Amino acid sequence: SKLPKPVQDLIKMIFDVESMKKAMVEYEIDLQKMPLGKLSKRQIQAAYSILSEVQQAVSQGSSDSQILDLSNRFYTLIPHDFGMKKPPLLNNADSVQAKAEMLDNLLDIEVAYSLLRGGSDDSSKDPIDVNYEKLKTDIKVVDRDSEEAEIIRKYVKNTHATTHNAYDLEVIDIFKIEREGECQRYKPFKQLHNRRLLWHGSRTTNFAGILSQGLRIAPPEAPVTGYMFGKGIYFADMVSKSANYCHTSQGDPIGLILLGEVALGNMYELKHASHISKLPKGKHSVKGLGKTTPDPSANISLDGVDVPLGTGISSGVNDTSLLYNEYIVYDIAQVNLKYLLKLKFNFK
Numbered sequence: 001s002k003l004p005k006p007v008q009d010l011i012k013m014i015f016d017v018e019s020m021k022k023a024m025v026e027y028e029i030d031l032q033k034m035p036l037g038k039l040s041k042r043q044i045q046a047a048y049s050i051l052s053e054v055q056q057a058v059s060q061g062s063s064d065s066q067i068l069d070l071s072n073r074f075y076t077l078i079p080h081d082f083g084m085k086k087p088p089l090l091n092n093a094d095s096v097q098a099k100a101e102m103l104d105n106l107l108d109i110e111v112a113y114s115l116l117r118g119g120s121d122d123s124s125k126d127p128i129d130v131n132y133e134k135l136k137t138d139i140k141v142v143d144r145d146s147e148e149a150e151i152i153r154k155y156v157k158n159t160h161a162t163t164h165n166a167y168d169l170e171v172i173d174i175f176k177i178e179r180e181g182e183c184q185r186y187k188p189f190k191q192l193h194n195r196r197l198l199w200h201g202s203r204t205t206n207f208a209g210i211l212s213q214g215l216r217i218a219p220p221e222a223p224v225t226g227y228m229f230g231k232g233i234y235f236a237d238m239v240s241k242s243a244n245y246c247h248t249s250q251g252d253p254i255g256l257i258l259l260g261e262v263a264l265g266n267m268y269e270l271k272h273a274s275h276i277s278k279l280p281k282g283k284h285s286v287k288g289l290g291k292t293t294p295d296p297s298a299n300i301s302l303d304g305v306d307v308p309l310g311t312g313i314s315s316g317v318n319d320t321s322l323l324y325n326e327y328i329v330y331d332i333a334q335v336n337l338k339y340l341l342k343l344k345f346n347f348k
């Protein structure tokens with residue numbers, strides 16, 4: 001009752017058990033054999049190791065049956081329902097990427113559903129108040145006419161890529177967030193140079209986890225797929241690049257995005273896929289060099305932090321496998337989430 005409507009609107013939204021169920025069904029998971037309440041960490045941890053066993057087998061060149069065994073084992077562990085359609089073999093990069101994408105969501109779906117059942121949920125206290133406390137995060141509404149509000153709205157407007165011409169982004173709510181202990185954790189990197197305010201798009205069902213446990217790196221068991229520069233935390237300077245990872249449908253055009261203080265330091269600027277996790281001496285990050293970059297001449301120093309809100313301009317790089325820039329850090333302590341934005345997607 002006692003929280004601002006937008007802050008409340010956000011809790012019910014991120015803690016929706018019905019939205020969690022929707023995602024499971026969209027991954028073709030058998031909710032009769034694998035309900036929301038059966039999902040466990042060691043089960044998803046096991047599901048990662050099988051995908052890593054699959055990608056190793058395919059690489060080492062295995063036999064139909066031994067490769068088929070891991071496909072059966074994965075589905076036996078994570079009950080799937082394909083109806084009358086035959087179960088698709090997990091024996092290729094597209095097959096593993098799609099299952100690895102699912103586990104990421106299922107990981108943050110578990111972390112969220114566990115929170116909901118956890119705690120001394122009694123009766124007198126408003127469901128919102130109860131759940132907002134469980135995130136261990138100070139969520140405060142940013143005023144419409146504030147300084148930061150104009151900066152954040154300039155950033156959204158100017159960094160929307162010409163390629164991403166399928167929606168128009170519309171800002172609904174801006175929240176100044178501060179995760180419990182994050183500043184104490186980030187403290188060793190606050191002094192570091194090249195600190196930037198960057199974007200991070202993610203599915204709505206993952207935010208109760210993102211605000212609960214912060215932005216995280218894939219576990220060692222996870223297959224090394226989907227991401228261009230290894231297991232690390234990925235950001236964009238282009239809003240629409242991150243906004244794409246909200247997976248907003250025409251029926252559900254409401255999604256959430258992030259702005260985190262990423263302590264980049266000396267960036268190991270690459271142009272083509274390169275798995276590392278272990279950076280080179282003196283480097284603190286990786287920068288995926290894109291053909292299009294926000295105007296470096298139009299940089300802003302909001303709170304002594306670099307904000308590349310420049311209009312989309314082409315960088316002088318053409319020998320690169322990347323359309324737009326991306327940034328990766330391999331230490332979760334180098335991130336410090338500042339804002340959470342509620343965005344409307346207006347499809348053409």
Ligand SMILES: Cc1nc2ccccc2c(=O)[nH]1
Binds near residue numbers: 236241245326
């Ligand atoms: C999950 C995720 N991956 C990304 C990769 C590149 C750039 C941005 C993102 C992002 O925002 N979320």
